[PDB]
Design a binder for this molecule. Structure first.
Ligand SMILES: *[C@@H]1O[C@H](CO)[C@@H](O[C@@H]2O[C@H](CO)[C@@H](O)[C@H](O)[C@H]2NC(C)=O)[C@H](O)[C@H]1NC(C)=O
Ligand SMILES: *[C@@H]1O[C@H](CO)[C@@H](O[C@@H]2O[C@H](CO)[C@@H](O)[C@H](O)[C@H]2NC(C)=O)[C@H](O)[C@H]1NC(C)=O
Ligand SMILES: *[C@@H]1O[C@H](CO)[C@@H](O[C@@H]2O[C@H](CO)[C@@H](O)[C@H](O)[C@H]2NC(C)=O)[C@H](O)[C@H]1NC(C)=O
Ligand SMILES: *[C@@H]1O[C@H](CO)[C@@H](O)[C@H](O)[C@H]1NC(C)=O
Ligand SMILES: *[C@@H]1O[C@H](CO)[C@@H](O)[C@H](O)[C@H]1NC(C)=O
Lengths: 94, 49, 198, 50, 50
């Protein structure tokens, strides 16, 4: 059984990074992406407004800068909605 | 925990030093794997309130 | 421990070899490790049982050595392919893949041979001396929103300027730095400076 | 001590009480001549894959 | 001590604030990679039954 892992000469070492510290790493990685775009991954983190940042991500795939701003309300409602369904997507399919 | 059995192992070779070293090397790797994936930021960034 | 990765490779294979020879001493349940002694002490009809017992434990050490060598060889193959992959990308060119060739924006990569490996000198670009400025998504002039062709609209707090993202060269907002797209009542957060047409 | 090797002169010094002389293994890398009490330097014959 | 991930830092995010570098640093890091291990060969007959 997994409750008593000792058994007979079978020790399960604990991970060096606890689930809490890993969550701190992920949260620090989320806050870097949101508040700094990619600049935090290549030196110091430089703050940039998120609507402005995602225009730069748009500009990197071909669509011009102004496509995002003229569709900010639609795009945000699209993102929000999707990030939602992803929670039920994992729940629906075990 | 049989002394007679343990006497046969020490005549059997140094397989254990190979096994426990292999599983120790496999143990350090797991710590390195999580470090490589996640520890990509030298600072802990905080979301604004 | 700078050259830790190569040092362990030299340690691992050498110590694996040293265990293999050291495996020869164990008697494996036989009378003696030295098989010439067994052939001299015991008669041939009853020395095979001791010889066979020694052989079974002996080749099994070879089986372990080869198997762990095959696994280790596969690990180096992945490491060699990664080095070959980033020899072609980081050295023979410039890589846009973030944090692939050195942390920061990559410029160059000079390799150097090392014993049983390679060493890369990733010449990266790291910004510094950051300054906090007030930005704006666009700049309405005549009711028509202006978006920068390159860079970002930035304001020293008094005037507006357009500068590239990774370096601060404030340039006056002409009509060549920016492009027009539609009226300026649909962009959220638009400021309203004046675009000097050249 | 029965084996096969290239008997040769050894610069090693076998302290009086030191009979044989293994190395970092188990191989009698040296022997003291029963007679003439000389330190030999038994080394394996030069084999090799072809 | 309990491990510390790193120096906690808060980014001054704001609807209308941008941070732009006025300088750079040409940092030359280094990367070490194994390429080839030691080519070893064995002989069963000379090893198992000398
Ligand atoms: C911000 O805008 C500009 C940038 O320096 C400054 O206005 C300048 O003032 C000098 C003073 O002689 C004159 O050349 C012009 O009036 C401007 N020239 C430029 C565009 O450099 C202004 O003083 C700055 N103010 C702040 C808040 O930094
Ligand atoms: C930016 O400046 C323009 C140019 O004056 C402003 O347009 C006028 O602003 C006044 C003041 O609110 C209004 O009474 C007028 O009706 C506006 N004219 C137009 C074109 O509708 C504009 O409102 C300013 N925008 C911001 C962000 O303050
Ligand atoms: C960018 O940084 C470099 C150094 O990292 C600065 O160059 C230094 O300038 C000071 C001037 O006060 C000199 O005393 C140093 O000797 C210089 N060092 C080097 C290595 O050149 C440079 O001035 C910075 N750029 C700006 C615009 O401030
Ligand atoms: C810029 O302003 C923000 C907010 O006031 C502050 O957190 C940051 O340290 C400032 N940076 C510089 C270089 O002054
Ligand atoms: C500006 O920033 C504040 C604090 O981050 C936020 O609550 C507010 O909604 C923003 N206003 C706009 C729309 O610029």
């Amino acid at each position: 059984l997994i409750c008593a892992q000792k058994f007979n000469g079978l020790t399960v070492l604990p991970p060096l990074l606890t689930d809490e510290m890993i969550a701190q790493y992920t949260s620090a990685l989320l806050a870097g992406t949101i508040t700094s775009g990619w600049t935090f991954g290549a030196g110091p983190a430089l703050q940039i407004p998120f609507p402005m940042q995602m225009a730069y991500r748009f500009n990197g795939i071909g669509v011009t800068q102004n496509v995002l701003y003229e569709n900010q309300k639609l795009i945000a409602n699209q993102f929000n909605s999707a990030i939602g369904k992803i929670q039920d997507s994992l729940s629906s399919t075990p | 925990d049989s002394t007679e059995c343990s006497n046969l192992l020490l005549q059997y070779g140094s397989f254990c030093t190979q096994l426990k070293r292999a599983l120790t090397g496999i143990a350090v790797e797991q710590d390195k794997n999580t470090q490589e994936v996640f520890a990509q930021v030298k600072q802990i960034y905080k979301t604004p309130p | 421990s700078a050259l830790g990765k190569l040092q362990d490779v030299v340690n691992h294979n050498a110590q694996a070899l040293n265990t293999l020879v050291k495996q020869l001493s164990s008697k494996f349940g036989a009378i003696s490790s030295v098989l010439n002694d067994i052939l001299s002490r015991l008669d041939p009809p009853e020395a095979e049982v001791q010889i066979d017992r020694l052989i079974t434990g002996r080749l099994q050490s070879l089986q372990t050595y080869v198997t762990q060598q095959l696994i280790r060889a596969a690990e180096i193959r992945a490491s060699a392919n990664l080095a070959a992959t980033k020899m072609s990308e980081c050295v023979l060119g410039q890589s846009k893949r973030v944090d692939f060739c050195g942390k920061g924006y990559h410029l160059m990569s000079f390799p150097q041979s090392a014993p049983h490996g390679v060493v890369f000198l990733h010449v990266t670009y790291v910004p510094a001396q950051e300054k906090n400025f007030t930005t704006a998504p666009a700049i309405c002039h005549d009711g028509k929103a202006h978006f920068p062709r390159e860079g970002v609209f930035v304001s020293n707090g008094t005037h507006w300027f357009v500068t590239q993202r990774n370096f601060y060269e404030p340039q006056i907002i002409t009509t060549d730095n920016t492009f027009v797209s539609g009226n300026c009542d649909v962009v959220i957060g638009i400021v309203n400076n004046t675009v000097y047409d050249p | 001590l029965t084996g096969t090797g290239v008997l040769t002169e050894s610069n090693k010094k076998f302290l009086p009480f030191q009979q044989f002389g293994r190395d970092i293994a188990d191989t009698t890398d040296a022997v003291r001549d029963p007679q003439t009490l000389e330190i030999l330097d038994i080394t394996p014959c030069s084999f090799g894959g072809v | 001590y309990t491990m510390s991930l790193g120096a906690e830092n808060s980014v001054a995010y704001s609807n209308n604030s941008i941070a732009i570098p006025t300088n750079f640093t040409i940092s030359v890091t280094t990367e070490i990679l194994p390429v080839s291990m030691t080519k070893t060969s064995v002989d069963c007959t000379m090893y198992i039954c000398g």
